[PDB]
């Protein structure tokens, strides 16, 4: 509630959180190089969650505090339709793969098995990189002057 | 219940989890090089949690499923006193620093402020590396490779 404050606060959010998101995606790449695909999916999950958190905070000064994936994605696509392109459902395997990441937070550290191919991970990386590019753009476009 | 099964299962656990723990500690180093100290603390928290989870699974085929830190540490030190050396309280800053990591799972991704110095992180890295060395050793020492003598 105040033109100059609202700018300060939206800059603070975006600078605080977008770099966490980029870094999680980098950690994932690192872990793929290591051969630890399950923990890379976990980092991809975090890259994506953090990216949405960053989006919602920057543009509305609020984020759920569950930080639920479906929820934060829901809310974010609800605030700007351009974000739906990120996760196309024109092939089934795209949902299989996406669900692997979603399962990865809860499982992945803890389950005895957690199956994810190289191909799935390459796809989730491409998709995360577009989410990050777009989210970065949409956050800059929110410039109060 | 079964000498050869119990060995298979304890190897499976340790091989499944110890490498997650090492890898979290490595990720932390990587993030320290990147200048992202808050997320490195987060990975350190996971390196430690995963290490204790690995310990308790290997030796007892069970782990809480809270995966609470105080808890899993409590349980793990309760089963082998050697693990108390890992987190000495002979300086106050050691408790400040440890608490930073503990707070790091919950905060750190989410909070606006999360303060952790280079010195703190270096100390948490050294400590995590001893936990991992010790845990690795205690897991190998758990060998029912003898108790399947009765073949």
Numbering used by the authors:
A (entry chain A): 151 to 295
B (entry chain B): 151 to 301
Direct quotes from the study:
Two additional proteins, among others, are also required for Agrobacterium tumorigenesis: VirD4-coupling protein (CP) and VirD2-binding protein (VBP).
The monomers are arranged as anti-parallel dimers with a large buried surface area of 1203 Å2 (or 14% of the total surface area of each monomer). The dimer is held together by tight interactions between α1 and α2 helices from both monomers. A DALI search for the structural homologs of VBP C-terminal domain identified several proteins with a HEPN domain; this confirmed that the C-terminal domain of VBP adopts a HEPN fold (hereafter referred to as HEPN domain). The structural analysis indicated that the HEPN dimer is held together by contacts throughout helices α1 and α2; in particular, residues Asp173, Lys184 and Asn186 of the HEPN domain play important roles in maintaining the dimer. This residue, along with Lys184 and Asp173 of one monomer, is involved in hydrogen bonding contacts with Asp173 and Asn186, Lys184 of the second monomer. We found that a single substitution of Asp173Asn, Lys184Asp or Asn186Asp in the HEPN domain is sufficient to disrupt dimer formation, as verified by size-exclusion chromatography and analytical ultracentrifugation experiments.
